[PDB]
Amino acid sequence: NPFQFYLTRVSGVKPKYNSGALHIKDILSPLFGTLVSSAQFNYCFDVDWLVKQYPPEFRKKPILLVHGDKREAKAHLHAQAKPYENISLCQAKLDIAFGTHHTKMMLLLYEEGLRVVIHTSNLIHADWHQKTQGIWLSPLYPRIADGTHKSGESPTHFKADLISYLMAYNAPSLKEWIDVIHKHDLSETNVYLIGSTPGRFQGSQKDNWGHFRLKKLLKDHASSMPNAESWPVVGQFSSVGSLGADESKWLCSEFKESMLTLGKESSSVPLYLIYPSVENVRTSLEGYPAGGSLPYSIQTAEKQNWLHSYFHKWSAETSGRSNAMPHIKTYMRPSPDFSKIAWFLVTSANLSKAAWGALEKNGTQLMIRSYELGVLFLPSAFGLDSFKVKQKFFAGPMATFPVPYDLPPELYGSKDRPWIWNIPYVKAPDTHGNMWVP
Ligand SMILES: O=C(O)c1ccc(Nc2c(-c3ccccc3O)nc3cnccn23)cc1C(=O)O
Numbered sequence: 001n002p003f004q005f006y007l008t009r010v011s012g013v014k015p016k017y018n019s020g021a022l023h024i025k026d027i028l029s030p031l032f033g034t035l036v037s038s039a040q041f042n043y044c045f046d047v048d049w050l051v052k053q054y055p056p057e058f059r060k061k062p063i064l065l066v067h068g069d070k071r072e073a074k075a076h077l078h079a080q081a082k083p084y085e086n087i088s089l090c091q092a093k094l095d096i097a098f099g100t101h102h103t104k105m106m107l108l109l110y111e112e113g114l115r116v117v118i119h120t121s122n123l124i125h126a127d128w129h130q131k132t133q134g135i136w137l138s139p140l141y142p143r144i145a146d147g148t149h150k151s152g153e154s155p156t157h158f159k160a161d162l163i164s165y166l167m168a169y170n171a172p173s174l175k176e177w178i179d180v181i182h183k184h185d186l187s188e189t190n191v192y193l194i195g196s197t198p199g200r201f202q203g204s205q206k207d208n209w210g211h212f213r214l215k216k217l218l219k220d221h222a223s224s225m226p227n228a229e230s231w232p233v234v235g236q237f238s239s240v241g242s243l244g245a246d247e248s249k250w251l252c253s254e255f256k257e258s259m260l261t262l263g264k265e266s267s268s269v270p271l272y273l274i275y276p277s278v279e280n281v282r283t284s285l286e287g288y289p290a291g292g293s294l295p296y297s298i299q300t301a302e303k304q305n306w307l308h309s310y311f312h313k314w315s316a317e318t319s320g321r322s323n324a325m326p327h328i329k330t331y332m333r334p335s336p337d338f339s340k341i342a343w344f345l346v347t348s349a350n351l352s353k354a355a356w357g358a359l360e361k362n363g364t365q366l367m368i369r370s371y372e373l374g375v376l377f378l379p380s381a382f383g384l385d386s387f388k389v390k391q392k393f394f395a396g397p398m399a400t401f402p403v404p405y406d407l408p409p410e411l412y413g414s415k416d417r418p419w420i421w422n423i424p425y426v427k428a429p430d431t432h433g434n435m436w437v438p
Pocket residue numbers: 043044098100101102122238239292293294295348350
């Protein structure tokens with residue numbers, strides 16, 4: 001495979017389903033590089049746990065935690081890290097109300113080079129235990145020789161785009177990492193970066209972030225095919241924001257419109273949304289506590305019952321993970337028979353205006369509340385016109401893309417309900433014998 005797309009290890013599935021999966025201990029192993037320092041971008045951290053995931057010989061190397069916590073949450077994180085003198089912290093500014101620093105990324109500086117890891121897991125035990133999570137591993141980027149002047153840039157512009165993402169923080173600890181990235185050769189990168197940063201973007205900047213960034217890349221680097229209107233859009237996520245009183249407000253007017261873009265020329269496109277039902281969660285490896293990581297509140301849900309007619313169950317027989325609840329987020333464009341895909345995106349961004357952006361100011365300004373980061377796989381970046389879908393995720397013409405859940409997605413049954421995390425479920429017990437009482 002050229003894609004370097006991995007799932008995290010799941011405790012409790014047969015070895016066959018973990019063969020090519022990665023635990024965080026695998027990612028940080030000396031086999032991947034001799035660690036000099038690291039930056040851990042994330043939402044939630046268990047610092048004691050995190051340090052134990054580094055190899056013993058690397059546990060005193062400098063670590064930067066990039067987070068968005070404020071006030072007492074910020075104080076708690078500093079208290080977690082204070083026992084570790086090698087750990088520094090960077091508070092990402094969140095100057096727009098109700099924003100989150102969701103981005104999950106590792107910058108790993110080695111003696112041998114630099115690696116970038118963009119993934120979907122929080123840095124806590126439960127996120128790497130029994131969940132379906134996604135990982136993209138960059139190649140080992142070599143250092144550019146002192147005195148040599150070359151861009152180190154890839155055909156996908158990844159090096160400049162990653163620096164641009166980091167520059168948006170306006171943070172001194174991250175300017176240090178920008179300077180590290182400048183000194184390395186990222187030309188082998190074959191994915192496109194898709195980030196969200198908080199702000200209000202107009203004019204040139206409109207295309208830099210969020211769903212307008214995705215749209216711009218699909219216009220510039222994908223081709224429209226005949227019968228493109230029959231190629232569905234699939235979105236798959238672990239949390240749902242307030243989308244409005246009907247699908248015209250945002251979901252099918254600007255979000256779907258960006259997602260269905262192909263090529264440079266000017267909808268009945270089917271939209272499948274994958275989100276765990278109550279039954280998915282109940283029968284999961286974790287049981288109802290998996291629902292603590294599927295934050296969809298009843299206050300949000302009751303305002304948009306129309307949305308749930310788009311919901312499809314989580315099913316992942318292809319990767320042995322139907323009972324490993326998803327915290328990965330993915331978006332993709334399959335063919336009408338789901339045998340090919342026009343592109344695939346793995347990201348931290350959930351189905352929310354905060355993550356993807358919402359147009360303001362009579363369509364002239366894209367407002368984003370949160371930090372998000374993902375990578376986009378485009379056939380053109382691999383010399384292909386489409387990706388064939390890999391039949392079994394861990395099975396074995398390595399130019400087939402490993403989609404980690406089953407296609408076609410299966411619609412909710414009439415008795416199914418979306419997982420809503422702050423109401424009780426006391427009618428049937430979970431895999432550990434318990435009910436759910438918030
Ligand atoms: O991706 C995801 O599914 C995800 C979703 C939400 C999230 N944070 C969060 C929480 C929250 C509070 C306490 C325990 C868990 C929680 O989720 N409450 C809110 C309210 N509004 C915005 C964000 N909120 C973080 C992530 C993530 O994993 O980064």
